[PDB]
Amino acid sequence: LSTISRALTPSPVMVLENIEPEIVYAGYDSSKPDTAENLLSTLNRLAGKQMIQVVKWAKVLPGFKNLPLEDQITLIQYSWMSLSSFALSWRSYKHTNSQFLYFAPDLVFNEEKMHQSAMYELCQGMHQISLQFVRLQLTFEEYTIMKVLLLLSTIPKDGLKSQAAFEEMRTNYIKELRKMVTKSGQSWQRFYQLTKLLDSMHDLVSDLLEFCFYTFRESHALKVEFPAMLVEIISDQLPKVESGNAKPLYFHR
Numbered sequence: 001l002s003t004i005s006r007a008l009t010p011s012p013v014m015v016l017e018n019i020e021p022e023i024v025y026a027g028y029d030s031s032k033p034d035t036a037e038n039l040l041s042t043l044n045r046l047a048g049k050q051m052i053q054v055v056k057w058a059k060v061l062p063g064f065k066n067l068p069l070e071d072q073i074t075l076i077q078y079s080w081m082s083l084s085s086f087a088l089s090w091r092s093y094k095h096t097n098s099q100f101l102y103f104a105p106d107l108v109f110n111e112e113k114m115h116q117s118a119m120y121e122l123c124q125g126m127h128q129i130s131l132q133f134v135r136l137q138l139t140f141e142e143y144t145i146m147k148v149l150l151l152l153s154t155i156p157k158d159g160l161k162s163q164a165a166f167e168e169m170r171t172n173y174i175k176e177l178r179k180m181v182t183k184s185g186q187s188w189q190r191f192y193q194l195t196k197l198l199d200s201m202h203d204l205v206s207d208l209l210e211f212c213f214y215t216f217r218e219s220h221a222l223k224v225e226f227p228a229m230l231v232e233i234i235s236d237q238l239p240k241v242e243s244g245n246a247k248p249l250y251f252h253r
């Protein structure tokens with residue numbers, strides 16, 4: 001054990017900041033008409049590019065790499081939607097002050113786009129999270145920890161290969177959050193507000209997935225395109241979810 005090495009080691013929070021992926025661009029073609037077909041296909045394309053960066057992020061995520069390859073794949077598949085809309089809400093909060101849905105720098109949604117996307121209510125749900133970020137003045141530190149917790153929010157009804165190791169890393173990250181919001185009195189209130197917001201993601205993600213699975217099934221009739229990345233994810237996720245094999249983890253309720 002090195003006295004120096006231990007003192008110079010980055011806190012998990014600092015590591016989260018270092019590994020956070022750079023903002024990804026959607027490659028949105030502004031010359032094409034803003035119809036549901038084009039906007040949804042474009043969002044799905046963006047989703048793909050983002051998931052590729054998410055996997056690289058999870059690969060170097062403290063504690064995550066120590067999980068069986070099998071569990072890592074499962075966790076990612078189960079949570080990809082949760083991480084997507086949560087990151088969406090964050091960028092919207094930071095770069096727009098929650099005035100718009102900042103899917104990407106080249107793709108910012110206003111009320112109009114929301115209507116044209118044919119998923120207006122789902123957009124309102126995600127936007128409502130951003131509004132909360134404003135009311136709470138959420139910090140980037142709290143954000144990164146919470147995003148990690150979401151990665152570990154849905155598991156197999158029966159469990160992962162290394163259930164013990166998983167509950168460990170999870171509990172450690174929860175503790176990391178407690179420490180953040182403490183930097184008590186208003187600390188306990190803060191922590192509960194954040195865990196309560198994390199739980200609320202499940203009903204939101206449930207509705208987002210329902211529409212995702214629907215548009216996936218009717219992809220041809222709707223003319224909605226999906227990148228191989230998402231085809232790969234949804235193909236395997238959809239049946240597990242509809243089979244009741246996905247188990248949501250809550251803090252309350």
Ligand SMILES: C[C@]12CC[C@H]3[C@@H](CCC4=CC(=O)CC[C@@]43C)[C@@H]1CC[C@@H]2C(=O)CO
Pocket residue numbers: 040041043044046047050081084085087088102103104119122208209211212213215216224
């Ligand atoms: C999957 C989805 C398109 C892709 C988006 C997702 C909502 C969250 C999200 C946030 C992003 O920053 C990139 C795209 C994305 C992952 C939508 C919910 C339903 C919609 C469709 O099902 C289109 O067919």
